């Protein structure tokens, strides 16, 4: 929907995973941003062809079903009912609970989803996500998001997202941000630790 | 009821303005098309002789 930037920043030699998260939240409170609640993105893989059957708490009705690289079905509940019936064409492939859990913040129609990355129970990362509401068209407001990133991150300021290479002049889609989230999951699942 | 009463109260204020103050001139005009809750009205307090300059 709105243009989103997704990245990781590590512990960065300060205490623990959540210490830098609390530093970012107290920086945002110095700016003075109000909250809108929490958020969590959960993933789960399937295979016979890797099926990413995956969910987000921002849109719980949106059940994302992706290939490894093909089309994405942002489908409803009855698709999840149909998905159970195969069980031989597409095996369960359990133990894929790579999730991002955190809170959302608002500052004058600006939204931030900030939290930590866990492999189920054990947290081994920090997810950083910035976004803006009325960003309809993509690749036209990246100066705004870059300014917002350098405003309060300081170190570990990211840039040039992977879906920005998917250049098109239409409306930015939630699939782009979602793609960014699964690329984030691919970035974090390699190190484990 | 609150919309009607608030329009009546605004009318009372502008009638107090008209009766109390006739010095420059008073003009009140209303939109011919209106909503159930919100309205849009035009209030003009402009001098007696040279209104076409002070725009």
């Amino acid at each position: 929907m709105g243009v989103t930037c997704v990245s990781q920043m590590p512990v960065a030699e300060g205490k623990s995973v959540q210490q830098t998260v609390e530093l970012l939240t107290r920086k945002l409170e110095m700016l003075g941003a109000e909250k809108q609640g929490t958020f969590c993105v959960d993933c789960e893989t399937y295979h016979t062809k890797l099926m990413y059957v995956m969910h987000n708490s921002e849109y719980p009705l949106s059940c994302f079903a992706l290939f490894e690289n093909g089309p994405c079905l942002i489908a409803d509940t009855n698709f999840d009912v149909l998905m159970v019936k195969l069980k031989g064409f597409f095996q369960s492939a359990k133990a894929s609970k790579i999730e991002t859990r955190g809170t959302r913040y608002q500052y004058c129609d600006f939204l931030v989803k900030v939290g930590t990355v866990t492999m189920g129970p054990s947290a081994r990362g920090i997810s950083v996500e910035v976004e803006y509401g009325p960003c309809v068209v993509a690749s036209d407001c990246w100066s705004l998001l870059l300014e917002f990133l350098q405003s309060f991150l300081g170190s570990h300021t990211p840039g040039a997202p992977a879906v920005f290479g998917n250049r098109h002049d239409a409306v930015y889609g939630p699939a782009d941000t979602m793609v960014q989230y699964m690329e984030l999951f691919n970035k974090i699942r390699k190190q484990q630790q | 009821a609150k919309h009607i009463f608030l329009r009546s109260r605004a009318a009372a204020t502008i009638d107090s303005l008209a009766s109390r103050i006739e010095d420059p001139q008073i003009q009140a005009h209303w939109s011919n098309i209106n909503d159930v809750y919100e309205s849009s009205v035009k209030v003009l307090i402009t001098s007696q002789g040279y209104e076409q300059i002070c725009k």
Binding site: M1, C108, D109 | -
Partner: protein, 267 residues
């Protein structure tokens, strides 16, 4: 082509300036001396002017070749009746004058009906260019025309007229139902966005700014020309404060007669 025919002007002036300047170099050194009281005010000025005129010749020579680099490259009786029509175009500009729009109006106090097809002919004149925007004229309620305008992939605007004059204008984004559930155009609502509600006030101030007592066509044309600058929104930083966000707000306010994005604090 005229780019070379006007770039040749600097060189054809520069060579004659070279001739004049070398003539000055000759005769000023040939003039002898003008002491003007003290000698130190002359003999120290001797080397000053001798450097001055020689360096003027040198800089004229030097700026000759940068102009030379950029440049590139019945018999005569009926030719006379050709260019007079072309100078009649200048004759059209002879009686123009710079007085233009500005007048010396006093108070207008002493001591109508037009068809909607005329409004359609008005709206057909300016919709023919700017293909990135669209106009959809409709009158589902009376003879008054309210119009749907889409702006590329950015904005959806409802523009209500009445009595051939301006009634109202409300702007929203690109991913909202500007119609109602019945399908008619929405009349009374809100844009549900802080920036959009903030700039609707600027639109209301702008419609009361363009004031023509007889000629509302140029009023609405200047209005839509002003609106055309708003397809650059969220893409151009502010002209005085550098950054986009002033208290989180990008520059939006285009000044009257000088269209550039500002804020209320940024004026």
């Amino acid at each position: 082509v005229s780019v070379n025919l006007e770039a040749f002007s600097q060189a054809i002036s520069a060579i004659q300036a070279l001739r004049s300047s070398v003539s000055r170099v000759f005769d000023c050194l040939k003039d002898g001396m003008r002491n003007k009281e003290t000698l130190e005010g002359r003999e120290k000025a001797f080397i000053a002017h001798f450097q001055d005129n020689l360096h003027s010749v040198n800089r004229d020579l030097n700026e000759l070749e940068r102009l030379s680099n950029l440049v590139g490259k019945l018999y005569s009786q009926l030719l006379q009746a050709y260019k007079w029509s072309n100078k009649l175009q200048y004759h059209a500009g002879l009686a123009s004058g710079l007085l233009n729009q500005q007048s010396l109006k006093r108070s207008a106090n002493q001591m109508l009906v037009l068809p909607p097809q005329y409004v359609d002919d008005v709206i057909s004149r300016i919709d023919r260019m700017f293909p990135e925007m669209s106009i959809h004229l409709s009158r589902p309620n009376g003879t008054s025309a309210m119009l749907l305008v889409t702006l590329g992939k950015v904005l959806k605007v409802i523009v209500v007229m009445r009595s051939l004059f301006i009634d109202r204008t409300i702007v929203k984004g690109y991913n909202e139902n500007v119609y109602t559930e019945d399908g008619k155009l929405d009349i009374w609502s809100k844009s549900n966005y802080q920036v959009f509600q903030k700039v609707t006030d600027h639109a209301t101030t702008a419609l009361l700014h363009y004031q023509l007592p007889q000629m509302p066509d140029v009023v609405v044309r200047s209005f839509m020309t002003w609106l055309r600058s708003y397809i650059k929104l969220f893409q151009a930083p502010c002209q005085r404060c550098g950054k986009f966000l002033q208290d989180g707000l990008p520059p939006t306010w285009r000044d009257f007669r000088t269209l550039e994005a500002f804020h209320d604090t940024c004026r």
